[PDB]
Structures are given as structure tokens and as C-alpha cells.
Design a protein around this ligand. Structure first.
Ligand SMILES: *[C@@H]1O[C@H](CO)[C@@H](O[C@@H]2O[C@H](CO)[C@@H](O[C@@H]3O[C@H](CO)[C@@H](O)[C@H](O)[C@@H]3O)[C@H](O)[C@H]2NC(C)=O)[C@H](O)[C@H]1NC(C)=O
Ligand SMILES: *[C@@H]1O[C@H](CO)[C@@H](O[C@@H]2O[C@H](CO)[C@@H](O)[C@H](O)[C@H]2NC(C)=O)[C@H](O)[C@H]1NC(C)=O
Ligand SMILES: *[C@@H]1O[C@H](CO)[C@@H](O[C@@H]2O[C@H](CO)[C@@H](O)[C@H](O)[C@H]2NC(C)=O)[C@H](O)[C@H]1NC(C)=O
Ligand SMILES: *[C@@H]1O[C@H](CO)[C@@H](O)[C@H](O)[C@H]1NC(C)=O
Ligand SMILES: *[C@H]1O[C@H](CO)[C@H](O)[C@H](O)[C@H]1NC(C)=O
Ligand SMILES: [Ca+2]
Ligand SMILES: [Ca+2]
Ligand SMILES: [Ca+2]
Ligand SMILES: [Ca+2]
Lengths: 5, 117, 178, 6, 208
């Protein structure tokens, strides 16, 4: 998964 | 004597079944689809035993220690069909018989029930 | 004086002393933790996965509850609003801009100073003045005025101008001079 | 996950 | 060299550099602004009036007598009494059977287990191999737990939806139920000789 907001 | 092993914790999502061993407790989660291990007294030393693609429902630990031996009072019973253990002190066994059968007054022999249904 | 950090991949929140010695896990399995704050006895963090705000005891993570329901749109960032003044102390930068040109920050020992964002700057005069790095320096006997004009340190703050802009006689250096 | 095993 | 404190017969109030001598300690009112000039227990007893009142062992430091309890005992709410802790009340301190003793504990466990070198942990007396079996949808996965290592393999070949599991020690057979097939099966732990137990009458077997 991504780690951005 | 009610105690909490794991509580107020996010390690549990939708746990289904558990089994024990020496100072360890194993359980399966249907939410995260993984089998877990923890200390059975305070829930520490946790780790993931297994990841499963499908939901893991059942779990058992196979070992003789999980299956302690004892005397079999039912082994001396004269009950026909079913002989079920019981907690009553004098005998610790009780005769029973399947669906559609009649318990005779002998308390050990059963006869098929011919009544309609 | 403890430092708390939350890892969104290992999925746990940890604490340690300000020197980073005593690592401990205050709460394991904290999900996809975004920014975290500490107030009172509890620590509060926002989770990107379950879209909730959680709390737990700051020492052992025992009383873990969710502060809100499932928020509609994935909260991010959290802080605490407090009315009481917090640990006030006297900074050295108020007095004559900490003895520096324009920008200073209170460091562990005295005022600590830095140059602006834009420009090929470099530090001079015990790193208290900001000048343009023209590829030139002056030796241990010349004081450096601003813009690079550098003259012998005896005239430095002699209550007489010695440069093209009066940089030497600025009060920033003459506030405490020998 | 729902409770019913089905 | 040249120490930055007061050596010899002086003691310093923490939070300050104020040095006071051996007689100024707890001389009266809390003179040091931090309150460390005096302590709540300061010279409660001289550690000479019948062991200073402490039930086991008194000793006087800079701030008067302190009561010592032997390893296992605990200082009571009243500081001068040492009492026995109930080590069996802590859950899991003794694995199976705990007996509280005077400043001590006793442990034992069932004949299937043997107590370890430490008098708390009990381990299975037989070697065998602790075998963990988990019911995934289309596969019955069995783990061979040994030396902190898990080995995964499939017990049986033709299951569809297993929801429940158990085993019989006498015959060494694993019992499981299939939700889609509506049957209960029994097989040996090596995957051979699978038999049907219930072929009808089962709808949703939650547990066995
Ligand atoms: C999988 O494990 C089971 C565990 O029971 C094995 O069953 C056991 O197999 C042995 C050898 O076939 C049986 O011993 C034999 O017993 C007969 C009398 O019944 C005797 O005449 C032979 O000389 C021999 O001793 C043993 O009884 C049997 N256990 C039970 C409880 O039935 C099975 O063989 C294993 N399968 C594989 C493929 O390894
Ligand atoms: C995980 O296991 C470790 C030991 O490997 C536990 O750590 C010790 O636990 C005992 C009993 O509470 C303490 O007396 C020791 O001081 C602990 N030592 C260390 C190195 O921490 C630990 O408690 C277990 N996990 C948790 C969270 O309970
Ligand atoms: C779990 O693993 C152990 C170790 O590999 C297995 O024990 C061996 O079993 C074979 C027979 O299949 C024996 O010939 C070896 O002597 C055994 N070795 C040891 C170290 O005991 C054991 O069979 C496995 N258990 C199961 C049920 O799969
Ligand atoms: C000790 O005594 C005080 C005052 O009676 C009481 O409030 C406290 O709970 C006691 N603590 C213990 C652990 O005995
Ligand atoms: C002033 O001159 C003395 C001469 O010994 C020292 O160099 C001192 O560091 C100087 N301080 C300032 C602020 O100019
Ligand atoms: Ca849940
Ligand atoms: Ca000058
Ligand atoms: Ca005093
Ligand atoms: Ca005791």
C-alpha cells in the first residue's frame, strides 16, 4: 500500500 | 476467577477458535486471515504462526498432554447403545439411546419407539 | 522528557528517553498510524486504515479505546490545544537579535544563527554574520564586514565606521564587545 | 467478517 | 580534579549546591527550598530499640532507619513490618499447581509434565512432536512445531470446506467436518485410511 495521506 | 489474557488490544479482529499448549495459546482470526500465538497467562510474546489465503476456522493442538488419561467408568457399564459419562458421584455414567428409542425402566436397555411422528 | 514515535509499517508505537536509550513498545498493533500527540496520561494517534482516532495509556497502553467512530474521509494529523503556558524560558535571541545579522535560533549554548534560503551564503565571524560566498576568505586578523569587505579586527567596533555600510558598527556586535 | 460461518 | 561539590562530612540538597553537615540533616523545618533537607521517614527509629521496630532487619542511612525484608518478603503499608507475598496470586507465576509458603512458594504439575530447573515452568514429559492443525477452506494445514520452526503441509487431499477439527489420542485419528459436503470424516495423522463418520444429518457443524 501507499504511505501518503 | 475471571481474568483477561488479551483485552483492549488491536491484535484481535474477529477471532474464531483457540487451543492451548504448555504456557501458549493459539487462535485463528477470520478478519485478518492468520493464525496467532501468545502467552496463555498474560498475552505477551505474540507472533504470527501462519498466514492463510482463506479464513481459518478450526484449530487443534495434537499431543498426548492435551488428552490426559483417566479411569473409564463407562467401560464397566452394561448400557445398550449409548453409555454417556456423567458427573453424578455414585456411578459417573448414564445410559442413553438414540433418536426414536425408548428408555426402559431397567435404565440400561432401550427399545425402538414405534409411536408415530 | 520522553520521545514517542509511531511506525505505520511495523504497526506499533514506541517510546524512549530523549537520548534514545530505553526503547519500549507502549502499544503494539497500532495499525496505520499517522501523526501522534501526547497529553495528560494518554497518547492519541490517528489511523489511516480504520479512519479512527485512538488513545492508550502512555506507560503500558492498557486503556485502549477509540475516540471517534469511523470517520468518513481518512483523518490525518493531530495536535492538542492547551490554554496554560508551557515551560516558558528566556531565549537569547531577543537581546540584539542574539548578536547576529537577521536570523537566529536558540541552541543548546547561546544563540545559533543561519543565513536566508536564497543566496550562495556562508558563515563568518564565529558564524554570527552572513555573507555571500564569493570564493574568498580573510585570515585570522581581519574582521569581515557584510558583503565581503573585510578589515583588520582592531578597528572592529571601535565606535567609528570602517566599511561601506557601517556593518562593523552595528549594535549586534557592539552590544557585548571588549 | 460476518459471524455466520456460511 | 578540584571537585565541583562538597566532599567529607557534607551532604548536598538535590536541586541546589547547598552543602550541610552530618548534624544539619533533618535538623528541623524543611529549610532547603526543595524540601530534601528532611524526609518523611527521617530518624523514625534509631535501629536500636529492639531491632529498631523493623520485624526483620533495620539499617540507618543518611535519613534514619530503613527496614529490610529477605528476598521473597515485601514491606507492608506500615513500613516497619515485612510480610509474605502470595506468589500464587500472580497469574502464570507457577504454571500448573502453586502452594503459597512463608516467604516462599512450592510448585508441582501433573504426571504428563515435568518441572524444569527453575521451580516454576513445567514441560511435557513425553517427547512426541507438538502438532498444530488448522482448517483452511479447501485444505487442512498441519504445523509440525519444533525448535521455534513451523513446517506446513496438507493432511488430506479431497476436502471442500472444513470448519471443525478434533483428534482422538487412542487411535491417532483426526476428526473434521465438511460444510459443503455435509459429512464428518476421520483420517490418520499421515493422511491414510480416511473414513466417513457421519454421512447424513449434519447441516452446519460449528464445532466438534
Ligand atoms: C499411518 O499411521 C497409522 C498409525 O496407526 C499406521 O497404522 C498402523 O500401521 C501398522 C503397520 O501397518 C499396524 O501394525 C500392524 O498391525 C497388524 C495387526 O493389526 C500386525 O499384524 C502387523 O504385524 C503390524 O504390527 C498398526 O496396527 C497400525 N495402527 C493402527 C492403530 O491401526 C499406518 O500404517 C500409517 N500409514 C503409513 C502409510 O505409514
Ligand atoms: C516476552 O518475553 C520476554 C522474555 O523473553 C519477557 O521479558 C521478561 O519478562 C519477565 C516477566 O514479566 C520480566 O521479569 C523480565 O524483566 C522481562 N525481561 C525483559 C528482557 O524484558 C516479556 O515480558 C514478554 N513480553 C511481554 C510484553 O510480556
Ligand atoms: C515432525 O518432525 C519430526 C522431525 O523431522 C519428525 O520426526 C521424525 O519422524 C521420522 C518418521 O517419519 C523418524 O524416522 C525420525 O527419526 C524422526 N526424527 C525426529 C527428530 O524425531 C516427525 O515425524 C514430524 N511429525 C509429524 C507428525 O509430521
Ligand atoms: C495503605 O494505607 C492507605 C491509607 O489507609 C490506603 O489508602 C492505601 O490503599 C494502602 N495501600 C496498601 C497497598 O496497603
Ligand atoms: C574582545 O577582546 C578580547 C581581547 O583579549 C577578546 O578577544 C574577546 O573575545 C573580545 N570580545 C569581543 C566581544 O570583542
Ligand atoms: Ca471485532
Ligand atoms: Ca569600527
Ligand atoms: Ca531542615
Ligand atoms: Ca509466599
Amino acid at each position: 500500500x501507499x504511505n501518503x495521506x | 476467577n475471571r481474568r483477561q489474557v488479551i483485552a483492549s488490544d488491536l491484535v484481535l479482529h474477529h477471532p474464531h477458535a483457540l487451543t492451548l499448549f504448555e504456557d501458549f495459546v493459539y487462535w485463528t482470526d477470520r478478519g485478518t486471515r492468520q493464525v496467532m500465538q501468545a502467552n496463555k497467562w498474560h498475552g505477551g510474546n505474540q507472533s504470527v504462526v501462519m498466514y492463510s489465503v482463506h479464513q481459518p476456522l478450526g484449530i487443534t493442538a495434537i499431543h498426548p498432554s492435551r488428552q490426559p488419561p483417566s479411569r473409564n467408568p463407562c467401560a464397566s457399564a452394561s448400557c445398550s447403545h449409548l453409555c454417556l459419562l456423567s458427573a453424578q458421584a455414585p456411578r459417573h455414567y448414564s445410559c442413553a439411546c438414540p433418536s426414536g428409542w425408548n428408555l426402559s425402566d431397567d435404565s440400561v436397555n432401550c427399545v425402538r419407539g414405534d409411536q408415530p411422528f | 522528557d520522553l520521545l514517542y514515535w509511531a511506525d505505520a509499517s511495523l504497526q506499533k508505537i514506541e517510546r524512549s528517553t530523549l537520548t534514545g536509550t530505553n526503547r519500549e513498545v507502549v502499544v503494539s498493533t497500532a495499525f496505520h498510524s499517522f501523526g501522534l500527540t501526547v497529553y495528560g496520561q494518554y497518547i492519541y494517534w490517528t489511523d489511516l486504515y480504520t479512519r479512527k482516532i485512538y488513545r492508550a495509556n502512555k506507560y503500558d497502553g492498557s486503556d485502549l479505546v477509540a475516540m471517534t467512530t469511523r470517520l468518513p474521509t481518512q483523518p490525518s494529523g493531530i495536535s492538542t490545544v492547551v490554554k496554560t503556558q508551557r515551560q516558558q524560558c528566556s531565549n537569547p535571541c531577543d537581546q540584539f537579535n542574539g548578536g547576529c545579522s537577521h536570523i537566529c535560533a536558540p541552541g543548546p549554548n547561546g544563540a545559533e544563527c543561519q543565513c536566508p534560503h536564497e543566496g550562495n551564503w556562508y558563515l563568518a565571524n564565529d558564524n554570527k554574520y552572513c555573507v555571500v560566498d564569493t570564493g574568498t576568505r580573510c585570515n585570522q586578523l581581519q574582521f569581515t564586514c557584510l558583503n565581503g569587505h573585510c578589515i583588520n579586527q582592531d578597528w572592529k567596533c571601535d565606535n567609528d565606521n570602517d566599511c561601506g555600510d557601517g556593518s562593523d558598527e552595528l549594535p549586534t556586535v557592539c552590544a557585548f564587545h571588549t | 467478517x460476518x459471524l455466520x460461518x456460511x | 580534579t578540584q571537585p565541583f561539590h562538597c566532599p567529607s562530612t557534607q551532604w548536598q540538597c538535590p536541586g541546589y549546591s547547598t552543602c550541610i553537615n552530618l548534624s544539619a540533616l533533618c535538623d528541623g523545618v524543611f529549610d532547603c527550598p526543595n524540601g530534601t533537607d528532611e524526609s518523611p521517614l527521617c530518624n523514625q527509629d534509631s535501629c536500636s530499640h529492639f531491632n529498631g521496630g523493623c520485624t526483620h532487619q533495620c539499617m540507618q542511612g543518611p535519613f534514619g532507619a530503613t527496614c529490610l525484608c529477605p528476598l521473597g518478603y515485601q514491606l507492608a503499608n506500615d513500613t516497619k513490618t515485612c510480610e509474605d507475598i502470595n506468589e500464587c496470586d500472580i497469574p502464570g507465576f507457577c504454571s500448573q499447581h502453586c502452594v503459597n509458603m512463608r516467604g516462599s512458594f512450592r510448585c508441582a504439575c501433573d504426571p504428563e509434565y515435568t518441572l524444569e530447573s527453575d521451580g516454576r515452568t513445567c514441560k511435557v514429559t513425553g517427547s512426541e512432536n507438538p502438532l498444530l492443525v488448522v482448517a483452511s477452506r479447501d485444505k487442512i494445514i498441519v504445523d509440525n512445531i519444533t525448535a521455534h520452526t513451523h513446517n506446513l503441509y496438507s493432511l488430506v487431499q479431497d476436502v471442500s470446506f472444513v470448519v471443525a477439527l478434533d483428534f482422538d489420542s487412542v487411535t491417532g485419528r483426526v476428526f473434521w467436518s465438511d460444510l459443503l459436503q455435509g459429512k464428518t470424516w476421520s483420517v490418520f495423522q499421515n493422511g491414510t485410511d480416511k473414513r466417513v463418520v457421519h454421512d447424513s444429518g449434519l447441516s452446519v457443524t460449528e464445532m466438534i
